[PDB]
Design an enzyme around this catalytic site. Sequence first.
Site, short mmCIF file in Angstrom:
data_model
loop_
_atom_site.label_atom_id
_atom_site.label_comp_id
_atom_site.label_asym_id
_atom_site.label_seq_id
_atom_site.Cartn_x
_atom_site.Cartn_y
_atom_site.Cartn_z
N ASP A 92 0.85 -1.19 0.00
CA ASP A 92 0.00 0.00 0.00
C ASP A 92 0.89 1.25 0.00
O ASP A 92 2.11 1.18 0.15
CB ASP A 92 -0.95 0.03 1.19
N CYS A 285 -13.39 -27.49 7.41
CA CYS A 285 -12.07 -26.93 7.14
C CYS A 285 -10.96 -27.96 7.04
O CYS A 285 -10.82 -28.89 7.84
CB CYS A 285 -11.72 -25.92 8.25
N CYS A 287 -7.67 -27.08 6.95
CA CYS A 287 -6.41 -26.54 7.46
C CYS A 287 -5.78 -27.45 8.49
O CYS A 287 -6.37 -28.31 9.12
CB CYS A 287 -6.73 -25.14 7.96
N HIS A 316 -5.76 -20.79 11.01
CA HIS A 316 -7.09 -21.29 10.63
C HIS A 316 -7.82 -20.23 9.81
O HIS A 316 -8.44 -20.45 8.76
CB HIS A 316 -7.97 -21.70 11.85
ZN LIG Z 1 -9.28 -24.77 10.03
#
Ligand SMILES: [Zn+2]
EC number: 2.4.2.29
Lengths: 349, 349
Positions: A92, A285, A287, A316
């Site tokens: 940025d 999920c 992950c 996560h």
């Molecule tokens: Zn997760």
Amino acid sequence: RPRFSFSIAAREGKARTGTIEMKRGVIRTPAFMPVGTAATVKALKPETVRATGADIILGNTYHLMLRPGAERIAKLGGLHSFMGWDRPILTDSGGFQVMQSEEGVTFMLSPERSIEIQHLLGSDIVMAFDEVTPYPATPSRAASSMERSMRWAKRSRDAFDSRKEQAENAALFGIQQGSVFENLRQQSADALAEIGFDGYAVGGLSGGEGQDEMFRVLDFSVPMLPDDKPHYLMGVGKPDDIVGAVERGIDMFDCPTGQAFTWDGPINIRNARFSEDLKPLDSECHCAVCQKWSRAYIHHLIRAGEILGAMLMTEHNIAFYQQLMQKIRDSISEGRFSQFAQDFRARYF
Amino acid sequence: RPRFSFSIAAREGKARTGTIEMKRGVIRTPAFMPVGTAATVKALKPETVRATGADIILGNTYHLMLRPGAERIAKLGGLHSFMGWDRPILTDSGGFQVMQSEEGVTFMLSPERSIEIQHLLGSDIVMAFDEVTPYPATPSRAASSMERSMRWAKRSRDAFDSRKEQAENAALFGIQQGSVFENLRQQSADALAEIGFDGYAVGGLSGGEGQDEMFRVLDFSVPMLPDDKPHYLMGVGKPDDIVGAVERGIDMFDCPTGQAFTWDGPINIRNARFSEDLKPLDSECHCAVCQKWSRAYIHHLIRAGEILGAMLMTEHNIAFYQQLMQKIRDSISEGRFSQFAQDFRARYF
Ligand SMILES: [Zn+2]
Ligand SMILES: Nc1nc2[nH]cc(CN[C@H]3C=C[C@H](O)[C@@H]3O)c2c(=O)[nH]1
Ligand SMILES: Nc1nc2[nH]cc(CN[C@H]3C=C[C@H](O)[C@@H]3O)c2c(=O)[nH]1
Ligand SMILES: [Zn+2]
């Protein structure tokens, strides 16, 4: 690899999915950019950030310019080398975080110095330096501020172009302003198009207007930008904001780093109801965090103030965002994004 | 695998190298045990702790019993499952961190409750509950305190033995007391031997006496313990303390988690001299941190208060300790430990 090549592979309505190819790698779009503030994505090694599926990260300029210093980072080899992330980095312009004259702002940061700092960092995608239009803003003030931004947009273009290694190896995005006013957004788009940029950001939103108003501004604002270049919605990150934004033509986002995201909505892991819950954060999920630890453990970690709690929660949440982006890309590619969007928020809320 | 089998593979003087075999894994000795305080080794995932070469970790009982609670951890499957570490865990008795009657201490923790809490956690190596002898201590007080500890040692043995799953699956270590007084250390060793334990800790040291006095107490104290069982020096961890302690017969240590250890001595990474140093923390270190990041980067991270700074510093320091332990084991095995010890501290100081 080319300096910059955006290719659209599939469309559904206003939504697009594709790729940006750059010298350091391919960015799959629509894309979510984890943020690194002081040359680190909070509590994650770069290899962990990559493992979540991120293709590019955002580096905050404001902080780097204060510490450790842009010149210092260049002396040490650039930001990629310094922090250990070798894939693209979007920087940025540094101004939002400061944010005053036509030359720039002292707090000395000007279009030219901003572009120089991003060069010193070795940024792949460089943001033009703009003036923050506060929300809400009267028409006159939004107009004055938008005009100044377009002048600074031209100064940014010329500063970037005057630096051969930057011009040959990095990309430059311009930022559209104009608050919530259609005619100002149009004048802004037109100005930026006339100057010419590799990509176009929608600036000025997510600042108190609320999702309904943001979507309404996007409705008319994104079609004004060149269709054939990426559209970046700056500082917008709630999952539902992202889905709606992609429905309106946005290809890139930045903003996940006790709140855990789930497909059923956010949860605050510190809540006592999770103290003996052996389920993972999210039951679908993929992950590594949901593969190995329970809500109960992370609840304990966060309540105890342990660093591993922050590490797990961050991994996560970023993975969840990348999975969201992947589901979006696949559904556009498969022409079922509208249904995806409906299904997502029936369950998310 | 057996519940407990200590085998000595090689000796050099008083130093020993070998293995402790347990149901959850093999512990190479002399061994350094990273500490987990609230069911986490600060700022590291268990897989990272393992990657440094740790074979066993220490779990602090005091904290766990307060949060999240021993019963709760048992309800959730035990500490190994809760935290994701599936190799041996040594638990302390919880008393040091509290530290009052013959029954125990209210702050209610007694020999029996301590052993029960360690059972609930699912500990592999259980520490008998002792009474802290402060340093310095008069002869009368050290004696009174040592005697009480031996009574509590017997209570610990009988509590442990009265629990079949614990007796069949875990080991029990006794703790020698007696401050700096040889006759008290002898009475203590004799008492513990008569009761019988799987291993013997030297308690009471590293509490203001200084290295010279500690070594002098060790000189006479470790030969009093059964030779054929492990010798654990509690709460001793500087690299030079460890080398000297191994020279005196110690097989296990616990205590690394801005100070970075190096073969040339500790450095404080926050010092301005490292702000542009592109070397790794230690030029010979094999850890993933020294493979990938510079002193300059870690200096910045720590000065900025970033979590990744703590993560990297901790991983390096624990790896450094495991490399030290490995060098010690190899040199004893090869009969060149005395030379190793000389070489180490010629360079370390
Ligand atoms: Zn997760
Ligand atoms: N420089 C740049 N960075 C940015 N981050 C987020 C936004 C979007 N801005 C809104 C957020 C806060 C301000 O009040 C403004 O109402 C943006 C931008 O418009 N420009
Ligand atoms: N429970 C147990 N844990 C332990 N950690 C460290 C030590 C060694 N103690 C010394 C450290 C502080 C005290 O003043 C004592 O002088 C120890 C022990 O002797 N027993
Ligand atoms: Zn290292």
